[PDB]
Amino acid sequence: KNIDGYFKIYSKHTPINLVRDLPQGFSALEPLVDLPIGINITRFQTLLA
Amino acid sequence: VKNKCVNFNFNGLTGTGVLTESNKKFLPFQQFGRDIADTTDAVRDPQTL
């Protein structure tokens, strides 16, 4: 997430045994790092090995 | 100085109170705790974590 001129990152590493689909449950997302980037971001892509 | 009526400001918060050690364990990102009434009750000391 990018807010108020800052670019923030969150994380979680929950272990699951149900491979099929999204598990019912509750994992909160802590703010991992905060950094003041601040860009009018409009697009999005991921990089796969 | 702890267990004594002292006027204090942490990060410029300001206020008067009794500084005591807390057993509550903040998450790493958090710095200020608050009460039900959104009044500052717990703080993380700046110089020493």
Written overview of the protein:
- The PDB classes it as viral protein/antiviral protein.
- Keywords: neutralizing antibody, receptor binding domain.
- The structure is cut from a larger assembly and holds two copies of chain A (49 residues).
- With 49 residues, chain A is mostly beta strands.
- Helices cover 0% and strands 29% of the residues of chain A.
- Chain A contains no helices and three strands.
- In chain A, strands 1-2-3 form a three-stranded antiparallel sheet, with no helix packed on it.
- In chain A, strand 1 (2-3) and strand 2 (6-11) form a beta hairpin.
- The two termini of chain A are 24 Å apart.
- The chains hardly touch.
What order do the SSEs of chain A take from the amino end to the carboxyl end, as H and E? Answer: EEE
Distance between the terminal alpha carbons of chain A, to the nearest Å?
24 Å
Placed side by side, the strands forming the largest sheet of chain A appear as 1-2-3
Sketch the major β-sheet of chain A. Answer: 3 strands, antiparallel
Q: Compute the number of helices of chain A.
A: 0
Protein name (chain B): Spike protein S1
PDB class: viral protein/antiviral protein
Keywords: SARS-CoV-2, Coronavirus, covid-19, antibody, neutralizing antibody, receptor binding domain, spike glycoprotein, antiviral protein, VIRAL PROTEIN-ANTIVIRAL PROTEIN complex
Entry title: Structure of the SARS-CoV-2 S 2P trimer in complex with the human neutralizing antibody Fab fragment, BG1-24
